[PDB]
């Protein structure tokens, strides 16, 4: 019962999308909280003397995949399978597909893709395409562009007459209610889930997004067809621009993301005042609080980092270090969202956040001690004033 889409999306070339909307999944990569779900998109190109399958579905949906595929083509007539990326969320249906096809097919992948298909599935008959290589298949020119580390070294994109099959590149979370970018309302709601996808999945490799976009700018792109989320037929440059904007960490003016843990309320009281001072100074804080009642999603925290003007952390000391969920959060921010942005740290003295961040691009403006009873609130207002002046 997940929703399945199968639609013809171009007449010439004759191209179908096969999309399943995973509303079963709760954690992408087994960690990122995605209550909004994610889709898996595969494509079929039907030509004279060729039927080209591009990517696939997650392995637990392999049966639904063959059933949906069978409605648009007899799998026995498939001659080529292009694998832009071998991660099983896109490639999990491949062994079932190859068995269903029941005879040899040409399988096309990057150099690293072939090694992964071999390791994962025992697949041996893989044709390796190199960067810029062109193949004539069913009378049409397929061009293959290596875009490595987006987010694995096997990642490539397939170019067909202006149509880019890009798998992860251009992906996003969320199950949109149409296939494509033909509705503004849908596009605007979708984009933050693209942001969430970029950071959680590709964030460590964001510099490769800039190189990737640069490599692709040489090509005339009419449409972008990714392996997840919306297809872009009307304005592919808008999706690419967004990828770049997230990668660079272009800030929204006024946006400050505040993240803290609060066990007894001593941190909460300092934080509540910091947040008020932010508002009172014209800022729009987005607040993530770890407490004995509430637990934010790390995927949501990460999603909010790239377009923040600045970050604020409130940190309890805990034993020899700091609070475990703050350690975890800082470590993920450093790994996936390492941006050159200003930070305030507020902390309780124990019996540190600094050394974690000190090999990052983040620059701590000041540290402020969170005290209990003798807490001088003047030093809160002072830290916020310092931030505002930095941002002027």
* Residue 134 binding target from a copy of itself, Cl ion, none, CB below 5 to 8 Å by type: none
My answer on whether omega of the bond before 13 falls inside 30° of 0, hence cis, is yes
Residue 254: which residues within 8 A CB-CB, separation 6 or more? 282, 283, 284, 309
Tell me the HSE value of 170 on the side-chain side, using a 13 A CA sphere: 32
Closer residue to Cl ion, CB minimum distance, 234 or 358:
358
Residues touching Cl ion, count (CB under 5 A): 6
Choose among Cl ion, a copy of itself, none what residue 334 binds, the Cβ cut-off being 5 to 8 Å by kind.
none
Q: Considering the complex, state which of residue 22 and residue 309 has its C-beta at the smaller distance from a copy of itself.
A: 22
> Looking at the DSSP assignment, which residues form a beta bridge with residue 364?
343
Q: Show contacts with a copy of itself in window 314-373 (CB under 8 A).
A: 316, 318-320, 323-325, 327-328, 331-332, 335, 351, 371-373
- Among Cl ion, a copy of itself, none, what does residue 87 contact (CB within 5–8 Å per kind)? a copy of itself
* 122 in contact with a copy of itself (CB under 8 A): yes
End-to-end Cα distance, the chain: 52
Minimum separation from the CB atom of position 81 to Cl ion (A):
22
Helix, strand or coil, per DSSP, at residue 73 = coil
Please give the residues from 268 up to 297 whose contact with a copy of itself meets the rule CB under 8 A. Answer: 290-295
Task: Give, as ranges, the residues between 87 and 106 that touch a copy of itself (CB under 8 A).
Answer: 87-89, 92
Q: Is 307 near a copy of itself (CB under 8 A)?
A: no
Closest CB to a copy of itself among residues 120, 367: 120
149 binding Cl ion? (CB under 5 A)? no
Is 49 a binding residue for a copy of itself by CB under 8 A? The answer is no
Q: Does 27 bind Cl ion (CB under 5 A)?
A: no
Minimal distance, residue 354 CB to a copy of itself, in Å? 19
Q: Residue 288: helix, strand or coil by DSSP?
A: strand
Q: State the binding string over 258-277 for Cl ion (x if CB under 5 A, else -).
A: ----xxx-xx----------
Does 208 bind a copy of itself (CB under 8 A)? Our answer is no
How many angstroms separate the Cα of 23 from the Cα of each of 35, 36, 173, 174, 176? 8, 8, 11, 9, 12
d(CA 224, CA 234): 9
CB contact burial 145-166 (16+ within 10 A = b; e otherwise) = bbbbbbbbebbbbbbbeebbbb
Number of residues that bind a copy of itself (CB under 8 A): 50
368/379 Cα distance (integer angstroms): 7
Residues 239-268 that bind a copy of itself (CB under 8 A): 261-266
> Residue 72 in contact with residue 53, Cβ under 8 Å?
no
Calpha distance 173→196 (Å, rounded): 7
Contact with a copy of itself (CB under 8 A) among 31, 178, 210, 219:
31
Residues 309-338 within binding reach of Cl ion (CB under 5 A)? 328
In the numeric block, which tokens belong to residue 117?
A: 């298909």
H or E element, residue 194: helix 184-197
Say which entry of a copy of itself, Cl ion, none residue 1 contacts (CB below 5 to 8 A, set by partner kind).
Answer: none
Residue 135's beta-bridge partner residues?
142
State which residue, 78 or 348, has the beta carbon closest to a copy of itself.
Answer: 348
| Residues whose CB is less than 8 angstroms from the CB of residue 365 and which lie 6 or more positions away in sequence, other chains included | 342, 343, 344, 383, 386, 387, 390
* Binding region for Cl ion (CB under 5 A): 262-264, 266-267, 328
* Binding region for a copy of itself (CB under 8 A): 24-31, 59, 87-89, 92, 118-122, 153, 204, 261-266, 290-295, 298, 316, 318-320, 323-325, 327-328, 331-332, 335, 351, 371-374
């Amino acid at each position: 019962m997940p929703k399945i889409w199968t639609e013809r999306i171009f007449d010439d070339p004759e191209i179908y999308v096969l999309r399943i909307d995973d509303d079963r999944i709760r954690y992408f990569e087994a960690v990122w909280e995605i209550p909004e779900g994610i889709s898996y998109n595969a494509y079929l190109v039907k030509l004279n003397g060729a039927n080209v399958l591009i990517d696939g579905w997650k392995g637990n949906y392999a049966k639904e995949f063959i059933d949906a595929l069978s409605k648009i083509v007899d799998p026995k007539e498939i001659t080529h399978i292009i694998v832009n990326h071998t991660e099983p969320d896109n490639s999990g249906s491949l062994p079932a597909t190859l068995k269903t096809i029941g005879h040899d097919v040409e399988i096309i992948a990057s150099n690293f893709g072939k090694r992964l298909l071999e390791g994962f599935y025992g697949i041996k008959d893989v044709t390796v395409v190199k960067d810029g290589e062109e193949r004539e298949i069913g009378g049409k020119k397929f061009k293959f562009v290596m875009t490595p580390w987006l987010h694995w070294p096997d990642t490539m994109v397939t170019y067909l007459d202006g149509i880019l099959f890009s798998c992860d590149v251009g992906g996003g979370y969320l199950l949109p209610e149409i296939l494509d970018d033909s509705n503004e309302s849908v596009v605007e709601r979708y984009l933050p889930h693209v942001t969430k996808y970029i950071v959680t999945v590709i964030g460590h490799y964001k510099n490769y997004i800039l190189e990737g976009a640069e490599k692709l700018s040489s090509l005339k792109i009419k449409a972008l067809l990714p392996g997840h989320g919306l297809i872009w037929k009307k304005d592919p440059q808008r999706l690419l621009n967004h990828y770049v904007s997230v990668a660079k960490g272009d800030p929204k003016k006024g946006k400050v993301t505040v993240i803290y843990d609060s066990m007894y309320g001593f941190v909460e009281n300092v934080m509540k005042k910091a947040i008020d001072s932010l508002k009172e100074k014209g800022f729009t804080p987005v607040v993530y609080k770890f407490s004995d009642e509430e637990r934010p999603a790390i995927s949501e925290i990460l999603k909010d980092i790239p377009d923040s003007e600045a970050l604020i952390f409130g940190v309890s000391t805990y034993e020899a270090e700091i609070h475990p969920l703050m350690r975890f959060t800082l470590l993920e921010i450093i790994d996936k969202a390492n941006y050159e942005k200003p930070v305030l740290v507020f902390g309780v003295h124990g019996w540190t956040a600094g050394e974690l961040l000190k090999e990052t691009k983040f620059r701590i403006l000041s540290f402020t001690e969170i005290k209990g009873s003798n807490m001088d609130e003047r030093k809160i207002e002072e830290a916020i004033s310092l931030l505002k002046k930095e941002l002027e």
